[PDB]
Amino acid sequence: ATFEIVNRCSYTVWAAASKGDAALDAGGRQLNSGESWTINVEPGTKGGKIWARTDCYFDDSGSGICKTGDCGGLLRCKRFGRPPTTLAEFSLNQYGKDYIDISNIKGFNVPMDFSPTTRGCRGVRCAADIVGQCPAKLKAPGGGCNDACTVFQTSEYCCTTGKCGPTEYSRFFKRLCPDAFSYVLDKPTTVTCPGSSNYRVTFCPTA
């Protein structure tokens, strides 16, 4: 499957793509404002994620640090990134269907649109100013708006027992971005697409 990753933000982001135990394609790349990065993702990929990282510094060898979404200090992410990270999530070719969603379960750093470039389903978007509106206790100093599980590490926010409800914090994310997951047991906002669809992830879609 083809993913076009487009940075419409006025600032540079370092895109990342991983399935948790391996990079997807090159795994990461700098995207200046306006740049597009096309990656190929193996059919059948389960649990892939794409996110943006902000305020990164890397050396010759691709080692460094980012203020949001750092994946163990690598340019080319092999693992998932450190919150806060708005997440484009996808599982491809699952019994003939693709499943895509946007998630705020790991917080929010960059607004995002996640849309098919082929026929048969709709896209999803979280483009509200979540960082500007972020509750004081969830603000990340590096930038971004943390989720409550990351901040407070309770069974209720992290849904560790498999039973949990919405919270004042999850409702904040949900109020600004109804089409994104706001906590683990949120009513699913997953979109079902035809198997082997292609996609575009746009950072700052309303920029």
PDB file of C-alpha atoms in Angstrom:
ATOM      1  CA  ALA A   1       0.000   0.000   0.000  1.00  0.00           C
ATOM      2  CA  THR A   2       1.139   3.544  -0.756  1.00  0.00           C
ATOM      3  CA  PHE A   3       1.045   6.291   1.881  1.00  0.00           C
ATOM      4  CA  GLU A   4       1.788   9.864   0.878  1.00  0.00           C
ATOM      5  CA  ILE A   5       2.861  11.839   3.945  1.00  0.00           C
ATOM      6  CA  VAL A   6       2.450  15.585   3.411  1.00  0.00           C
ATOM      7  CA  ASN A   7       3.691  18.339   5.723  1.00  0.00           C
ATOM      8  CA  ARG A   8       1.356  21.317   5.307  1.00  0.00           C
ATOM      9  CA  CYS A   9       2.578  22.854   8.584  1.00  0.00           C
ATOM     10  CA  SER A  10       4.600  26.035   8.397  1.00  0.00           C
ATOM     11  CA  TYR A  11       7.290  24.305  10.479  1.00  0.00           C
ATOM     12  CA  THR A  12       9.503  21.322   9.744  1.00  0.00           C
ATOM     13  CA  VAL A  13       8.351  17.976  11.091  1.00  0.00           C
ATOM     14  CA  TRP A  14      10.120  14.656  11.147  1.00  0.00           C
ATOM     15  CA  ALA A  15       7.639  12.059   9.984  1.00  0.00           C
ATOM     16  CA  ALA A  16       7.819   8.576  11.494  1.00  0.00           C
ATOM     17  CA  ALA A  17       6.272   5.265  10.450  1.00  0.00           C
ATOM     18  CA  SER A  18       6.535   2.071  12.484  1.00  0.00           C
ATOM     19  CA  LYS A  19       4.652  -1.067  13.408  1.00  0.00           C
ATOM     20  CA  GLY A  20       6.183  -1.126  16.897  1.00  0.00           C
ATOM     21  CA  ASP A  21       8.882  -3.741  16.377  1.00  0.00           C
ATOM     22  CA  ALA A  22      10.108  -2.532  12.972  1.00  0.00           C
ATOM     23  CA  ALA A  23      10.248   0.512  10.742  1.00  0.00           C
ATOM     24  CA  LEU A  24       7.732   0.920   7.944  1.00  0.00           C
ATOM     25  CA  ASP A  25       9.703   1.811   4.814  1.00  0.00           C
ATOM     26  CA  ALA A  26      12.645   4.031   5.885  1.00  0.00           C
ATOM     27  CA  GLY A  27      10.883   4.627   9.202  1.00  0.00           C
ATOM     28  CA  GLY A  28      11.387   8.377   9.303  1.00  0.00           C
ATOM     29  CA  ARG A  29      12.325  11.446   7.337  1.00  0.00           C
ATOM     30  CA  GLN A  30      12.560  15.198   7.655  1.00  0.00           C
ATOM     31  CA  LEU A  31       9.693  17.031   5.930  1.00  0.00           C
ATOM     32  CA  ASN A  32      10.107  20.737   5.391  1.00  0.00           C
ATOM     33  CA  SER A  33       6.965  22.812   4.990  1.00  0.00           C
ATOM     34  CA  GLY A  34       5.214  21.592   1.851  1.00  0.00           C
ATOM     35  CA  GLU A  35       7.280  18.438   1.348  1.00  0.00           C
ATOM     36  CA  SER A  36       5.706  15.072   0.578  1.00  0.00           C
ATOM     37  CA  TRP A  37       7.138  11.661   1.386  1.00  0.00           C
ATOM     38  CA  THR A  38       5.780   8.554  -0.309  1.00  0.00           C
ATOM     39  CA  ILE A  39       6.236   5.250   1.509  1.00  0.00           C
ATOM     40  CA  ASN A  40       5.280   1.684   0.697  1.00  0.00           C
ATOM     41  CA  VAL A  41       3.726  -0.416   3.450  1.00  0.00           C
ATOM     42  CA  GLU A  42       3.587  -4.194   3.103  1.00  0.00           C
ATOM     43  CA  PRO A  43       0.061  -5.581   2.621  1.00  0.00           C
ATOM     44  CA  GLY A  44      -1.239  -7.287   5.720  1.00  0.00           C
ATOM     45  CA  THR A  45       0.555  -4.844   8.022  1.00  0.00           C
ATOM     46  CA  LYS A  46      -1.169  -4.944  11.422  1.00  0.00           C
ATOM     47  CA  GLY A  47      -0.877  -2.101  13.905  1.00  0.00           C
ATOM     48  CA  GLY A  48       1.074   0.424  11.858  1.00  0.00           C
ATOM     49  CA  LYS A  49       1.308   4.022  13.011  1.00  0.00           C
ATOM     50  CA  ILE A  50       2.400   7.292  11.414  1.00  0.00           C
ATOM     51  CA  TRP A  51       3.099  10.395  13.469  1.00  0.00           C
ATOM     52  CA  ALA A  52       4.976  13.663  13.345  1.00  0.00           C
ATOM     53  CA  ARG A  53       7.911  14.601  15.546  1.00  0.00           C
ATOM     54  CA  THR A  54       8.722  18.221  16.307  1.00  0.00           C
ATOM     55  CA  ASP A  55      11.890  20.117  17.203  1.00  0.00           C
ATOM     56  CA  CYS A  56      14.350  17.376  16.303  1.00  0.00           C
ATOM     57  CA  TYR A  57      18.125  17.523  16.117  1.00  0.00           C
ATOM     58  CA  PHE A  58      19.999  14.665  14.457  1.00  0.00           C
ATOM     59  CA  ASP A  59      23.680  14.117  13.708  1.00  0.00           C
ATOM     60  CA  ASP A  60      25.454  12.503  10.726  1.00  0.00           C
ATOM     61  CA  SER A  61      24.448   8.977  11.769  1.00  0.00           C
ATOM     62  CA  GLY A  62      20.740   9.729  12.266  1.00  0.00           C
ATOM     63  CA  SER A  63      20.924   9.866  16.077  1.00  0.00           C
ATOM     64  CA  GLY A  64      19.496  12.681  18.152  1.00  0.00           C
ATOM     65  CA  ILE A  65      16.408  13.843  20.038  1.00  0.00           C
ATOM     66  CA  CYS A  66      12.958  15.274  19.338  1.00  0.00           C
ATOM     67  CA  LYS A  67      10.759  17.240  21.724  1.00  0.00           C
ATOM     68  CA  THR A  68       7.650  15.250  20.755  1.00  0.00           C
ATOM     69  CA  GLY A  69       7.372  11.726  19.372  1.00  0.00           C
ATOM     70  CA  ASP A  70      11.019  10.734  19.843  1.00  0.00           C
ATOM     71  CA  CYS A  71      11.517   7.049  18.972  1.00  0.00           C
ATOM     72  CA  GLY A  72      14.599   6.217  21.008  1.00  0.00           C
ATOM     73  CA  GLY A  73      16.660   9.000  19.466  1.00  0.00           C
ATOM     74  CA  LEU A  74      16.622   7.681  15.885  1.00  0.00           C
ATOM     75  CA  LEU A  75      15.749   9.508  12.686  1.00  0.00           C
ATOM     76  CA  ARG A  76      14.506   6.214  11.228  1.00  0.00           C
ATOM     77  CA  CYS A  77      12.031   4.942  13.794  1.00  0.00           C
ATOM     78  CA  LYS A  78      11.996   1.238  14.583  1.00  0.00           C
ATOM     79  CA  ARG A  79       9.641   1.633  17.563  1.00  0.00           C
ATOM     80  CA  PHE A  80       6.758   3.888  18.540  1.00  0.00           C
ATOM     81  CA  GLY A  81       7.358   7.436  19.663  1.00  0.00           C
ATOM     82  CA  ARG A  82       7.215   9.151  23.015  1.00  0.00           C
ATOM     83  CA  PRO A  83       3.932  10.994  23.751  1.00  0.00           C
ATOM     84  CA  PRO A  84       2.476  13.425  23.023  1.00  0.00           C
ATOM     85  CA  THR A  85       1.846  12.162  19.469  1.00  0.00           C
ATOM     86  CA  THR A  86      -1.246  12.466  17.328  1.00  0.00           C
ATOM     87  CA  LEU A  87      -1.479   9.009  15.752  1.00  0.00           C
ATOM     88  CA  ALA A  88      -2.577   7.806  12.346  1.00  0.00           C
ATOM     89  CA  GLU A  89      -3.236   4.110  12.940  1.00  0.00           C
ATOM     90  CA  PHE A  90      -3.934   1.405  10.408  1.00  0.00           C
ATOM     91  CA  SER A  91      -4.266  -2.316   9.932  1.00  0.00           C
ATOM     92  CA  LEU A  92      -4.204  -3.416   6.299  1.00  0.00           C
ATOM     93  CA  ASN A  93      -5.771  -6.409   4.527  1.00  0.00           C
ATOM     94  CA  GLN A  94      -7.563  -7.776   7.576  1.00  0.00           C
ATOM     95  CA  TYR A  95     -10.013 -10.311   6.127  1.00  0.00           C
ATOM     96  CA  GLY A  96     -10.389  -8.191   3.002  1.00  0.00           C
ATOM     97  CA  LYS A  97     -10.653  -4.789   4.711  1.00  0.00           C
ATOM     98  CA  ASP A  98      -8.392  -1.938   5.780  1.00  0.00           C
ATOM     99  CA  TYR A  99      -9.046  -0.221   9.117  1.00  0.00           C
ATOM    100  CA  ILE A 100      -7.844   3.324   9.775  1.00  0.00           C
ATOM    101  CA  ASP A 101      -8.259   5.760  12.621  1.00  0.00           C
ATOM    102  CA  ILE A 102      -6.771   8.796  14.277  1.00  0.00           C
ATOM    103  CA  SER A 103      -6.017   8.475  17.980  1.00  0.00           C
ATOM    104  CA  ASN A 104      -5.386  10.977  20.781  1.00  0.00           C
ATOM    105  CA  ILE A 105      -4.848   8.144  23.271  1.00  0.00           C
ATOM    106  CA  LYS A 106      -1.150   9.086  23.347  1.00  0.00           C
ATOM    107  CA  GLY A 107      -1.834  12.813  23.335  1.00  0.00           C
ATOM    108  CA  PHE A 108      -1.678  15.371  20.570  1.00  0.00           C
ATOM    109  CA  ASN A 109       1.202  17.253  19.039  1.00  0.00           C
ATOM    110  CA  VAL A 110       0.361  18.093  15.421  1.00  0.00           C
ATOM    111  CA  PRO A 111      -3.048  18.358  13.678  1.00  0.00           C
ATOM    112  CA  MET A 112      -3.632  15.660  11.111  1.00  0.00           C
ATOM    113  CA  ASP A 113      -5.892  14.447   8.313  1.00  0.00           C
ATOM    114  CA  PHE A 114      -5.854  10.728   7.404  1.00  0.00           C
ATOM    115  CA  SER A 115      -7.705  10.063   4.159  1.00  0.00           C
ATOM    116  CA  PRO A 116      -7.802   7.405   1.448  1.00  0.00           C
ATOM    117  CA  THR A 117      -6.569   8.400  -1.993  1.00  0.00           C
ATOM    118  CA  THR A 118      -8.600   5.546  -3.524  1.00  0.00           C
ATOM    119  CA  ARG A 119     -12.344   4.940  -3.534  1.00  0.00           C
ATOM    120  CA  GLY A 120     -14.663   3.388  -1.007  1.00  0.00           C
ATOM    121  CA  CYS A 121     -14.391   5.174   2.357  1.00  0.00           C
ATOM    122  CA  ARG A 122     -14.063   8.555   4.042  1.00  0.00           C
ATOM    123  CA  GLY A 123     -11.129  10.094   5.824  1.00  0.00           C
ATOM    124  CA  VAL A 124     -10.804  11.283   9.393  1.00  0.00           C
ATOM    125  CA  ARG A 125      -9.337  14.454  10.785  1.00  0.00           C
ATOM    126  CA  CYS A 126      -8.267  15.997  14.068  1.00  0.00           C
ATOM    127  CA  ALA A 127      -7.369  19.601  13.234  1.00  0.00           C
ATOM    128  CA  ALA A 128      -8.493  21.582  16.282  1.00  0.00           C
ATOM    129  CA  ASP A 129      -6.089  23.689  18.331  1.00  0.00           C
ATOM    130  CA  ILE A 130      -5.671  21.083  21.035  1.00  0.00           C
ATOM    131  CA  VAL A 131      -2.270  22.399  22.102  1.00  0.00           C
ATOM    132  CA  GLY A 132      -3.578  25.930  22.593  1.00  0.00           C
ATOM    133  CA  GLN A 133      -6.626  24.743  24.544  1.00  0.00           C
ATOM    134  CA  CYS A 134      -4.774  22.012  26.462  1.00  0.00           C
ATOM    135  CA  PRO A 135      -5.620  21.765  30.183  1.00  0.00           C
ATOM    136  CA  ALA A 136      -2.766  23.049  32.323  1.00  0.00           C
ATOM    137  CA  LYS A 137      -1.991  19.678  33.897  1.00  0.00           C
ATOM    138  CA  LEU A 138      -1.722  17.994  30.482  1.00  0.00           C
ATOM    139  CA  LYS A 139       0.541  20.549  28.774  1.00  0.00           C
ATOM    140  CA  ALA A 140       3.890  19.128  27.714  1.00  0.00           C
ATOM    141  CA  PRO A 141       6.822  21.551  28.156  1.00  0.00           C
ATOM    142  CA  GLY A 142       8.407  20.348  24.911  1.00  0.00           C
ATOM    143  CA  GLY A 143       5.156  21.180  23.134  1.00  0.00           C
ATOM    144  CA  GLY A 144       1.960  19.234  22.729  1.00  0.00           C
ATOM    145  CA  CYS A 145      -0.841  18.053  24.963  1.00  0.00           C
ATOM    146  CA  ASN A 146      -0.291  14.826  26.878  1.00  0.00           C
ATOM    147  CA  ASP A 147      -2.948  12.237  27.481  1.00  0.00           C
ATOM    148  CA  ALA A 148      -3.975  11.672  31.089  1.00  0.00           C
ATOM    149  CA  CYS A 149      -2.549   8.137  31.231  1.00  0.00           C
ATOM    150  CA  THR A 150       0.925   9.386  30.327  1.00  0.00           C
ATOM    151  CA  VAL A 151       0.688  12.131  32.952  1.00  0.00           C
ATOM    152  CA  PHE A 152      -0.992  10.398  35.884  1.00  0.00           C
ATOM    153  CA  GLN A 153      -0.420   6.645  35.364  1.00  0.00           C
ATOM    154  CA  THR A 154      -3.699   5.506  36.970  1.00  0.00           C
ATOM    155  CA  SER A 155      -5.719   2.404  36.167  1.00  0.00           C
ATOM    156  CA  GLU A 156      -8.648   4.622  35.201  1.00  0.00           C
ATOM    157  CA  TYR A 157      -6.814   6.788  32.671  1.00  0.00           C
ATOM    158  CA  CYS A 158      -4.758   3.909  31.288  1.00  0.00           C
ATOM    159  CA  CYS A 159      -7.734   1.487  31.330  1.00  0.00           C
ATOM    160  CA  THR A 160      -5.434  -1.161  32.796  1.00  0.00           C
ATOM    161  CA  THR A 161      -8.246  -3.374  34.110  1.00  0.00           C
ATOM    162  CA  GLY A 162     -10.092  -3.313  30.775  1.00  0.00           C
ATOM    163  CA  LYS A 163     -12.826  -1.377  32.582  1.00  0.00           C
ATOM    164  CA  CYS A 164     -12.648   2.408  32.506  1.00  0.00           C
ATOM    165  CA  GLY A 165     -14.907   5.298  31.655  1.00  0.00           C
ATOM    166  CA  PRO A 166     -14.459   8.646  29.970  1.00  0.00           C
ATOM    167  CA  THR A 167     -12.818  11.268  32.158  1.00  0.00           C
ATOM    168  CA  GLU A 168     -12.643  15.043  32.305  1.00  0.00           C
ATOM    169  CA  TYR A 169      -9.384  14.761  30.365  1.00  0.00           C
ATOM    170  CA  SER A 170     -10.601  12.344  27.701  1.00  0.00           C
ATOM    171  CA  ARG A 171     -13.715  14.477  27.172  1.00  0.00           C
ATOM    172  CA  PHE A 172     -11.492  17.454  26.400  1.00  0.00           C
ATOM    173  CA  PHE A 173      -9.833  15.623  23.497  1.00  0.00           C
ATOM    174  CA  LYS A 174     -13.217  14.266  22.386  1.00  0.00           C
ATOM    175  CA  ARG A 175     -14.873  17.697  22.428  1.00  0.00           C
ATOM    176  CA  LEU A 176     -12.229  19.174  20.115  1.00  0.00           C
ATOM    177  CA  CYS A 177     -11.767  16.044  17.943  1.00  0.00           C
ATOM    178  CA  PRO A 178     -14.856  13.807  17.985  1.00  0.00           C
ATOM    179  CA  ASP A 179     -13.501  11.637  15.171  1.00  0.00           C
ATOM    180  CA  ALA A 180     -10.371  10.563  17.076  1.00  0.00           C
ATOM    181  CA  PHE A 181     -10.076   8.029  19.884  1.00  0.00           C
ATOM    182  CA  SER A 182      -9.940   9.889  23.182  1.00  0.00           C
ATOM    183  CA  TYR A 183      -9.392   6.959  25.572  1.00  0.00           C
ATOM    184  CA  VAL A 184      -8.882   3.222  25.286  1.00  0.00           C
ATOM    185  CA  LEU A 185     -12.554   2.206  25.418  1.00  0.00           C
ATOM    186  CA  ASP A 186     -13.900   5.150  23.431  1.00  0.00           C
ATOM    187  CA  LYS A 187     -16.717   4.345  21.033  1.00  0.00           C
ATOM    188  CA  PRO A 188     -14.635   3.357  17.989  1.00  0.00           C
ATOM    189  CA  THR A 189     -14.090   5.944  15.283  1.00  0.00           C
ATOM    190  CA  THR A 190     -12.365   3.402  13.051  1.00  0.00           C
ATOM    191  CA  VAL A 191     -13.135   3.689   9.335  1.00  0.00           C
ATOM    192  CA  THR A 192     -13.439   0.528   7.242  1.00  0.00           C
ATOM    193  CA  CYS A 193     -11.845   0.842   3.807  1.00  0.00           C
ATOM    194  CA  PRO A 194     -11.523  -1.689   0.979  1.00  0.00           C
ATOM    195  CA  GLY A 195      -8.515  -3.957   1.331  1.00  0.00           C
ATOM    196  CA  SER A 196      -5.396  -2.583  -0.401  1.00  0.00           C
ATOM    197  CA  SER A 197      -6.497   1.043  -0.373  1.00  0.00           C
ATOM    198  CA  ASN A 198      -3.958   3.870  -0.582  1.00  0.00           C
ATOM    199  CA  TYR A 199      -3.768   6.820   1.763  1.00  0.00           C
ATOM    200  CA  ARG A 200      -2.533  10.313   2.427  1.00  0.00           C
ATOM    201  CA  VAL A 201      -1.546  11.621   5.854  1.00  0.00           C
ATOM    202  CA  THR A 202      -1.491  15.419   5.918  1.00  0.00           C
ATOM    203  CA  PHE A 203      -0.005  17.266   8.867  1.00  0.00           C
ATOM    204  CA  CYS A 204      -1.656  20.640   9.535  1.00  0.00           C
ATOM    205  CA  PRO A 205      -4.428  20.043   6.969  1.00  0.00           C
ATOM    206  CA  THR A 206      -6.085  23.429   7.536  1.00  0.00           C
ATOM    207  CA  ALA A 207      -2.827  25.420   7.466  1.00  0.00           C
TER     208      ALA A 207
END
